[PDB]
Design a binder for this molecule. Sequence first.
Ligand SMILES: CNC(=O)c1ccc(C(=O)Nc2cc(NC(=O)c3ccc4c(c3)c(-c3ccc(N)cc3C)nn4C)ccc2C)cc1
Length: 118
Amino acid sequence: GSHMASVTEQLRHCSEILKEMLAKKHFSYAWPFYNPVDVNALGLHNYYDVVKNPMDLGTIKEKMDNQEYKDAYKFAADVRLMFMNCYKYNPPDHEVVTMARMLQDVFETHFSKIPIEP
Ligand SMILES: CNC(=O)c1ccc(C(=O)Nc2cc(NC(=O)c3ccc4c(c3)c(-c3ccc(N)cc3C)nn4C)ccc2C)cc1
C-alpha cells in the first residue's frame, strides 16, 4: 500500500530517465538504440547467436507503457542488458561501443540518484 506507492514512484523516475535518453541532446550517440538493431540492413553476421536477449529503447518504452516493470531494478536490468548486448557483439573500439558507453553514462548517473522512497 504505502510500499507500492514508493515502488511506482521510482518507475516514474525511470520514465523521466527514459525520456532523457530519448531527448534530442543525446541523439548523436543514442540513435543506434532507439529501435531494434536492423540486422539485415547492417549486414550483421550471427547477431542472434551472440545476443540471445535483444533489447532496445523502443521495447523498453513499450514495456513502460504497458506497465510491465514490477519495479525500477528490472527496468534498470533491461537498459543494462541493451548496453551489454552492444558490448558483447561489437569490437571494443567500435564507434557504437563509444556511443553505448556515452549513453550509458547518462543512464547510470541519473538512475543512481532515484531516492529510496519517492
Ligand atoms: C559465436 N559468434 C561470435 O562470437 C561473433 C560473431 C560475429 C560477430 C560480429 O560480426 N561482430 C562485429 C560487429 C560489428 N558491428 C557493426 O558493424 C555495426 C555497425 C553499425 C551498427 C551496429 C554494429 C549496431 C549495433 C549492433 C548490435 C548491437 N547489440 C548494438 C548496436 C548499437 N548499431 N549500428 C548502427 C563490426 C565488426 C564485427 C566483427 C561477433 C562475434
